[PDB]
Amino acid sequence: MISILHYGYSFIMLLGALYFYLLSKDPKGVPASEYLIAMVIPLWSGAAYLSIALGQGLFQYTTIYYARYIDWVISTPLLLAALALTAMFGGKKNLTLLFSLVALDVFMIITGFVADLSIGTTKYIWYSLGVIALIIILVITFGPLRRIALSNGTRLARHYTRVAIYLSALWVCYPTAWLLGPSGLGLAQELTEVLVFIILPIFSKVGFSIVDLHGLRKLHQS
Amino acid sequence: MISILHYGYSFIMLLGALYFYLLSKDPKGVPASEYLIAMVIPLWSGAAYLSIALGQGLFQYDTTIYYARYIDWVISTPLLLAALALTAMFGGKKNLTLLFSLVALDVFMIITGFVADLSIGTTKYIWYSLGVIALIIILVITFGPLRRIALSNGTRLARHYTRVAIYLSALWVCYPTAWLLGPSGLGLAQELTEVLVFIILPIFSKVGFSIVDLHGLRKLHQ
Amino acid sequence: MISILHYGYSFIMLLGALYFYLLSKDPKGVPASEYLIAMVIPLWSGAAYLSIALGQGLFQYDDTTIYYARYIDWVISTPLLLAALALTAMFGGKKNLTLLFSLVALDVFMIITGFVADLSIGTTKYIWYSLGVIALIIILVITFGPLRRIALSNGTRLARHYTRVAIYLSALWVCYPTAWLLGPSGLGLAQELTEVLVFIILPIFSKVGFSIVDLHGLRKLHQS
Numbered sequence: 090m091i092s093i094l095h096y097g098y099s100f101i102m103l104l105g106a107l108y109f110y111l112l113s114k115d116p117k118g119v120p121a122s123e124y125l126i127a128m129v130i131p132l133w134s135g136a137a138y139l140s141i142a143l144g145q146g147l148f149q150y151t152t153i154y155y156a157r158y159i160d161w162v163i164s165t166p167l168l169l170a171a172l173a174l175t176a177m178f179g180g181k182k183n184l185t186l187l188f189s190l191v192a193l194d195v196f197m198i199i200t201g202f203v204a205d206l207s208i209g210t211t212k213y214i215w216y217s218l219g220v221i222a223l224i225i226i227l228v229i230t231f232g233p234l235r236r237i238a239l240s241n242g243t244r245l246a247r248h249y250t251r252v253a254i255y256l257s258a259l260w261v262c263y264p265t266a267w268l269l270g271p272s273g274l275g276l277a278q279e280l281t282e283v284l285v286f287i288i289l290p291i292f293s294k295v296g297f298s299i300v301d302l303h304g305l306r307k308l309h310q311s
Numbered sequence: 312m313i314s315i316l317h318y319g320y321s322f323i324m325l326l327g328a329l330y331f332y333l334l335s336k337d338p339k340g341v342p343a344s345e346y347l348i349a350m351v352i353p354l355w356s357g358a359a360y361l362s363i364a365l366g367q368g369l370f371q372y373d374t375t376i377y378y379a380r381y382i383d384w385v386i387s388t389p390l391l392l393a394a395l396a397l398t399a400m401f402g403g404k405k406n407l408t409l410l411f412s413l414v415a416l417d418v419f420m421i422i423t424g425f426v427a428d429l430s431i432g433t434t435k436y437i438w439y440s441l442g443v444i445a446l447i448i449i450l451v452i453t454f455g456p457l458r459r460i461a462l463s464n465g466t467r468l469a470r471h472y473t474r475v476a477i478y479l480s481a482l483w484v485c486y487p488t489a490w491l492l493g494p495s496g497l498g499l500a501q502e503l504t505e506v507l508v509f510i511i512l513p514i515f516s517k518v519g520f521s522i523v524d525l526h527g528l529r530k531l532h533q
Numbered sequence: 534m535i536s537i538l539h540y541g542y543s544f545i546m547l548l549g550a551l552y553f554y555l556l557s558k559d560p561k562g563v564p565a566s567e568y569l570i571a572m573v574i575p576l577w578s579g580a581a582y583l584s585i586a587l588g589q590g591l592f593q594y595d596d597t598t599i600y601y602a603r604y605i606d607w608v609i610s611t612p613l614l615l616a617a618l619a620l621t622a623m624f625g626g627k628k629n630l631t632l633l634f635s636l637v638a639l640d641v642f643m644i645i646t647g648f649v650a651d652l653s654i655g656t657t658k659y660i661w662y663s664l665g666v667i668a669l670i671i672i673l674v675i676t677f678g679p680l681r682r683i684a685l686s687n688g689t690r691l692a693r694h695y696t697r698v699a700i701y702l703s704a705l706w707v708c709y710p711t712a713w714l715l716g717p718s719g720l721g722l723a724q725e726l727t728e729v730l731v732f733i734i735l736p737i738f739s740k741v742g743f744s745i746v747d748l749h750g751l752r753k754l755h756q757s
């Protein structure tokens with residue numbers, strides 16, 4: 090079942106990527122960079138999850154789905170970049186703030202991988218550092234990054250706030266699932282975790298960019 | 312013989328790099344960034360191939376994986392594409408989105424090759440196939456939108472770009488052909504043959520390309 | 534012993550990072566990017582050294598201990614330190630990102646040669662070490678050559694500051710490969726504990742010390 094679920098995921102990623110490419114052909118005031126980001130996220134996640142489908146992106150230590158971390162270390166920082174560019178739409182870009190988020194995010198995923206490879210107190214030290222990174226990301230998202238959004242007008246700010254809440258809601262789910270699942274306290278069955286890390290990603294990897302791009306495109310007056 | 316061939320390669324890379332450094336001292340209208348790219352490519356490939364020469368950059372899997380090649384290509388090949396892209400954009404506005412589109416496709420391509428090499432049966436050829444699809448999309452961009460940018464920068468620049476585009480594209484298709492025929496693929500070609508092919512081709516791609524490229528661009532100065 | 538030393542280091546890194554964050558809140562004409570760089574360096578080094586403290590960032594090889602977490606640290610921290618130095622030279626002027634990424638490239642290569650050298654034995658080890666030393670020399674030539682000339686182009690006061698931080702960092706730079714060569718990774722003249730202490734103390738001066746000197750000097754140039 091696990092194999093089939095991952096094959097299906099990879100196919101949905103491919104479909105999402107194609108949709109964003111088609112949108113890119115009639116961009117409606119949205120820079121090409123934002124379409125490229127939107128496309129890379131699902132395509133990369135697709136490849137990683139395909140490796141799991143083929144029975145390659147995991148090993149025994151319990152089952153460590155290391156392919157997930159290879160996925161997130163690229164996809165999650167790109168998702169943050171997309172959100173940041175949305176905040177900066179119609180204004181001057183703050184790449185310092187953007188790369189601040191990328192750095193925090195990459196560290197977050199790495200702590201997760203190390204934590205998964207760790208046992209006892211060591212595991213939860215790394216997990217904890219990752220959670221601290223996530224909190225700082227959330228503070229930036231609803232603090233200085235939102236103030237940039239507000240500096241770019243009512244309509245843009247309204248869209249940013251919507252996508253910020255969307256992504257933030259999914260963000261908190263991942264570390265919650267991790268902790269409850271076999272990687273953490275082991276309260277949740279492996280199959281449950283597998284389904285959670287199939288469904289969430291669909292909403293984060295494709296869902297987010299659909300909401301984001303449509304909202305931005307709507308700001309265009311042709 | 313394999314060790315000696317790699318030592319010789321590394322020496323040629325060193326010579327090529329030094330030549331490009333000398334050219335950089337009297338740049339003739341070519342930005343410093345394009346000389347830096349030209350220098351990093353051979354120097355990086357040189358180091359990687361030196362590791363093989365020393366008997367480090369390979370392991371047994373029951374064939375020999377020259378993993379040092381993938382370490383080389385994951386850096387050298389995206390830089391080669393960047394160089395080609397900047398050539399197209401010479402004298403005009405740069406499209407970094409298109410450039411990083413090519414880098415992304417290229418890095419993915421090399422990774423699929425590494426995974427394919429570590430894979431067996433149908434799994435190997437799935438990854439190989441994904442890499443081939445990336446290469447095709449790179450070729451479509453190179454002779455499509457990227458060439459149209461070249462054409463927008465004048466007849467003389469376009470003529471040069473088309474020349475270097477065909478040069479690199481010719482070498483590009485050789486690598487996946489050799490891979491498939493050689494021990495990593497169908498195993499029709501002898502290991503020594505593959506070793507020689509992945510010594511000779513790189514010399515034309517890592518040094519040859521930049522010689523042709525830089526000379527052509529420098530010639531546009533007068 | 535070794536574990537406790539690394540825990541202490543990680544705490545000092547955290548304190549340094551917090552200090553730079555506080556400075557960033559009242560920037561005094563120093564761009565945000567330079568505060569971000571100043572913060573990432575110690576935070577990253579802290580995390581890496583914490584892994585050693587926990588007994589994860591090291592393994593046995595050649596019957597000796599490879600502290601591989603050091604290389605994970607340096608491959609990120611050392612290029613950021615060079616970027617910081619380069620941006621200092623370019624303070625008040627046009628950026629030369631080509632020169633900057635030239636230094637990053639040389640630096641990343643340098644650290645990698647060190648890792649490979651540490652995994653190597655006999656003549657192979659010292660070939661890699663040698664390639665790393667050549668990279669360091671080219672970095673020093675750039676630092677006191679073209680990069681200093683950029684500093685000079687940005688006025689007497691900035692140039693004076695750059696020269697000071699350039700000498701500071703360059704002095705620490707030569708120490709690392711000297712310690713490596715003398716320690717178990719090289720000739721094995723120095724005991725493991727001696728090397729461990731050197732690669733605890735130097736980093737404190739490089740990862741925190743440098744940015745304290747650098748940021749204070751730059752902030753001083755601010756008129757208000």
Ligand SMILES: CCCCCCCC/C=C/CCCCCCCC(=O)O
Nearest residue numbers: 122123162163166167170182191195
């Ligand atoms: C250990 C591996 C870590 C790799 C991390 C990779 C992170 C990739 C993310 C990059 C995001 C950069 C986006 C920049 C957008 C450009 C701004 C613009 O379009 O004007």
Ligand SMILES: CCCCCCCC/C=C/CCCCCCCC(=O)O
Nearest residue numbers: 342344385386389390393405414418
């Ligand atoms: C693991 C894979 C990582 C690949 C990294 C290799 C780097 C390839 C990227 C090169 C981009 C170069 C862009 C140069 C822009 C020049 C603009 C200018 O001259 O003003």
Ligand SMILES: CCCCCCCC/C=C/CCCCCCCC(=O)O
Nearest residue numbers: 564566608609612613616628637641
């Ligand atoms: C092995 C992976 C190594 C990757 C290196 C990571 C760090 C590289 C450092 C880059 C610093 C970039 C600084 C750019 C300066 C811009 C300043 C400005 O314009 O405001």
Ligand SMILES: CCCCCCCC/C=C\CCCCCCCC(=O)O
Nearest residue numbers: 184185188192195566569570573609
């Ligand atoms: C494995 C990766 C670990 C973390 C590395 C993080 C790298 C990025 C961090 C800092 C560099 C910031 C440089 C960007 C500033 C751009 C300024 C501008 O031009 O507006």
Ligand SMILES: CCCCCCCCCCCCCCCCCCCC
Nearest residue numbers: 254255258259281284285288289292
């Ligand atoms: C602002 C709204 C935030 C979310 C937007 C998109 C909707 C996401 C809803 C979450 C999807 C379900 C995730 C959990 C799946 C658990 C399945 C358990 C099966 C055993």
